[PDB]
Structure 1
Amino acid sequence: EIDTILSTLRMEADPSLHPLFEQFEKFYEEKLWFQLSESLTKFFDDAKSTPLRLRLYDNFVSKFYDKINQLSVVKYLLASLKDSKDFDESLKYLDDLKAQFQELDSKKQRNNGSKDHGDGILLIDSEIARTYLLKNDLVKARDLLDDLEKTLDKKDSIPLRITNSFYSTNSQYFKFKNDFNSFYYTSLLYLSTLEPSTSITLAERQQLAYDLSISALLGDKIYNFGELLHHPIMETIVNDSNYDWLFQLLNALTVGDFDKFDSLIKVQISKIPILAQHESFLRQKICLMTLIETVFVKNIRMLSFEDISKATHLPKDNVEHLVMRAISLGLLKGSIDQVNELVTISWVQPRIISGDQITKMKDRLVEWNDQVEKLGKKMEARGQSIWV
Structure 2
Amino acid sequence: DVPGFLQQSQNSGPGQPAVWHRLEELYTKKLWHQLTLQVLDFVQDPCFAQGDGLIKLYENFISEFEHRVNPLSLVEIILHVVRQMTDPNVALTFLEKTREKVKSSDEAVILCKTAIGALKLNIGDLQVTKETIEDVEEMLNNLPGVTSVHSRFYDLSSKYYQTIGNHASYYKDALRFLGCVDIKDLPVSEQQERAFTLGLAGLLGEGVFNFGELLMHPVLESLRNTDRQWLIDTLYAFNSGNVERFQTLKTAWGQQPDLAANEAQLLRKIQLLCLMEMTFTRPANHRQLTFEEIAKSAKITVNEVELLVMKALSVGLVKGSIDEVDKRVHMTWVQPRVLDLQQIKGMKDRLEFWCTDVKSMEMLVEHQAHDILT
Band the TM-score falls in, shorter-chain normalisation: 0.7 to 0.9
| 1:183 and 1:212 in contact (8 A); partners too | no
Distance 1:206 1:7 in 2: 43
TM-score of the two chains, using structure 1 as the length reference: 0.77
SS for the counterpart of 1:165 is: helix
Distance 2:21 2:231 in 1: 45
Partner of 1:108: none
Counterpart code for 1:309: A
Partner of 1:114: none
SS for the counterpart of 1:331 is: coil
Q: Does 1:140 align with 2:128?
A: yes
Q: Does 1:69 align with 2:70?
A: yes
Following superposition, the deviation at residue 125 of structure 1 comes to 1.0
Partner of 1:109: none
User: Which consecutive unaligned segments of at least 5 residues does structure 1 have?
Assistant: 106-116
Distance 1:6 1:127 in 2: 33
Distance 2:288 2:17 in 1: 72
Distance 2:372 2:60 in 1: 81
Change (3 A) 1:266 1:72: same
Partner of 2:156: 169
Distance 2:224 2:84 in 1: 24
Q: Does 1:28 align with 2:27?
A: yes
SS for the counterpart of 2:259 is: coil
TM-score of the two chains, using structure 2 as the length reference: 0.79
| 1:43 and 1:53 in contact (8 A); partners too | no
Following superposition, the deviation at residue 101 of structure 1 comes to 0.8
Aligned residues: 363
Following superposition, the deviation at residue 352 of structure 1 comes to 0.8
Q: 1:211 aligns with which of 194, 197, 202?
A: 197
User: Which consecutive unaligned segments of at least 5 residues does structure 2 have?
Assistant: none
Partner of 2:239: 254
Distance 1:51 1:332 in 2: 62
Q: 1:334 aligns with which of 320, 323, 343?
A: 320
- Percent same amino acid at aligned positions? 28
| 1:334 and 1:344 in contact (8 A); partners too | yes
Change (3 A) 1:275 1:22: farther
Q: Does 1:180 align with 2:179?
A: no
Partner of 1:292: 276
Counterpart code for 2:114: S
Partner of 1:129: 117
Instruction: Pick the structure with greater CA Rg.
Output: 2
Following superposition, the deviation at residue 191 of structure 1 comes to 3.7
Q: Does 1:235 align with 2:239?
A: no
Cα deviations across residues 209-243 of structure 1 (Å, max 9, x unaligned)? 233211221233424422222331353244346xx
Q: Does 1:156 align with 2:135?
A: no
Change (3 A) 1:5 1:159: farther
RMSD between aligned alpha carbons? 3.6
Q: Does 1:319 align with 2:305?
A: yes
More helix by share: 1
Distance 1:345 1:84 in 2: 62
Distance 1:29 1:82 in 2: 29
Counterpart code for 2:134: D
Of 207-216 and 361-370, more deviation after overlay is shown by: 361-370
Counterpart code for 1:192: G
Following superposition, the deviation at residue 245 of structure 1 comes to 3.3
